[PDB]
Amino acid sequence: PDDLQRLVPLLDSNRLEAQCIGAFYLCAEAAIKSLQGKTKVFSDIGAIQSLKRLVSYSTNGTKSALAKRALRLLGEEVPRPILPSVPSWKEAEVQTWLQQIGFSKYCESFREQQVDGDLLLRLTEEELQTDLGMKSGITRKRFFRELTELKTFANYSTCDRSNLADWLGSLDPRFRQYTYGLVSCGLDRSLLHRVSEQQLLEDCGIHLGVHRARILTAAREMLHSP
Amino acid sequence: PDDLQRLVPLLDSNRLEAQCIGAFYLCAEAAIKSLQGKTKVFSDIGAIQSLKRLVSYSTNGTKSALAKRALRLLGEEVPRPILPSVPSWKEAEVQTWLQQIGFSKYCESFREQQVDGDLLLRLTEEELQTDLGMKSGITRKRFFRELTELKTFANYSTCDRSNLADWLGSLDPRFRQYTYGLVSCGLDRSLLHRVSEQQLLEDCGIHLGVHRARILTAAREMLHSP
Amino acid sequence: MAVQLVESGGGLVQPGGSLRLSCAASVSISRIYVMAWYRQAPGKQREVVAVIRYDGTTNYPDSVKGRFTISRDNAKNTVYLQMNSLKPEDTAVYYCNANVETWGQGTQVTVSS
Amino acid sequence: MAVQLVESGGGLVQPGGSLRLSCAASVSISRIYVMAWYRQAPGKQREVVAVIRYDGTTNYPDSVKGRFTISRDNAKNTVYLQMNSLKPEDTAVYYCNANVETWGQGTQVTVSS
């Protein structure tokens, strides 16, 4: 009824605990009101719209799990994000991406070398500095900031069989950016458990020692699961 | 009959399990209908054409094995791919290949140095950069992408006695590209089992550490088979 | 699966004056990562005029800062562009853009008497 | 074992107008890795106009994108080339090509009154 309307904006809170308890309450009374016929209260109060909103792009296991349980109890379907299919791109999409991020002054060079999505996702600093013309380290740092923002929000489904992206995202959302370096080199979820650090450094292109160490321990812990 | 026609396009599915069960069904009823005289249903329903299609260029042990068993039960012959005989080429075929892949602006240099198939399959980055003129690392990366696509689909029968190509392909289809580096250096299936990693790095030209490690373990496991 | 975008608005106005363009999609906008508006003048190439992400952070080029404004509307799946103070050179065909790949068809916009 | 290719089509048409060329092989096309069409104008060297692999992914040069189209036909072993909008400079001898080595014999194509 009208009491439920007070619990409708609380979810917009900045802190975690408010969101957690709001989701626990709504999901619990959804489970209560689910067996009877009255499920139409969620329709006309418009809480379903906020739930269908917040489930996508959320890295919070408790609230997202509760929202999924609430939606699947009402017989609806959970949404999923619509991410760019970066590793199957051509030069036109690369150039419009360069228009979008603001590096429009380099669109000529990226056209002459015919850089596409597979070549975009495997760029290093030598290709940037020597032949693409980004001389200043500040500009390369800005470019890599934008690139690593893109790489965490791509769609690797056309090339990732073993679903490595979710395994990397479960550790830390910042880690998903490495998935293409693990797949093009050949790895997968089954044979991951016996890689060395020195192979992670130059083949998979992981540079931060902390990320190498966390990935190594988390992989090596999943030692002989099959 | 007409029921079989419903199982005729299902094989075009993207997922594996649909293809697997369709092949299991068709092969099983082929084995059932094989001892009687009625084998002509496979003729006039046109399923044999799709089977003769999908057996070549397929890296899937279950479905391809089932398709082979189905064909060999009907007394037919399995097709085999028709691959280029790269390591016996001349300069004319090299130049038309350069027309085909799109690197037509380098056909002059590859003619002056008289690069042929044996020299094509043993190119490194120093020969590309210094004297063939590919200065930019992006262009060399594109060239090597095309080359490694060609090398996995070549015909090494005129130079590979011990059938090393199938042994490498059984591990991973991406690995077949290394076969010529193993044969020109001298190796074969019998004496492979006692090579070191440091010999695989600069003699056989394998650069990725992951591929070296997988090849080493898979060879060393086949230790003293004869 | 392929999202379809349709634009609306456009036409002609006088120098000085506002207009609002709308772009409607086939799915929920709140699933799409980025959406953007693009502008192509006759005789030149395309360029960006506004972007907006899933969390509603927007970037504008320096040319049109303060004069344009992009917003999502979650009631009906539609992204709006608001053009407040217009110049004579702001006449072109405008396109709506989903993630990167998919485009719209465009709407012509002209500024004169 | 050596596959034989035979072409058909060719002749002459007017500027503007379509044509279709056919190339038939001795074995199943679905076994061949790549097939391609080539074009040699009088007074110059050969060049590619279309390729197609075993999985049916095709590449065209920038010169003829949108105007040509290559396809496999699995009923009878034959690869087709479709030439829709013709120019005066698109007159040459055309050849069919199997994997790399084997060639056809060619067919002359001319565009005028």
Residue numbers in the entry:
A (entry chain G), B (entry chain H): 324 to 549
C (entry chain g), D (entry chain h): 1 to 113
Paper text:
Sterile alpha (SAM) and Toll/interleukin-1 receptor (TIR) motif containing 1 (SARM1) is an autoinhibitory NAD-consuming enzyme that is activated by the accumulation of nicotinamide mononucleotide (NMN) during axonal injury. SARM1 is a multidomain protein composed of an N-terminal 27-aa mitochondrial localization signal, an Armadillo repeat motif (ARM) domain, a SAM domain, and a C-terminal TIR domain. Truncation studies suggest that TIR is the catalytic NADase domain, while ARM serves an autoinhibitory function. Here, we generate a nanobody, Nb-C6, that specifically recognizes NMN-activated SARM1.
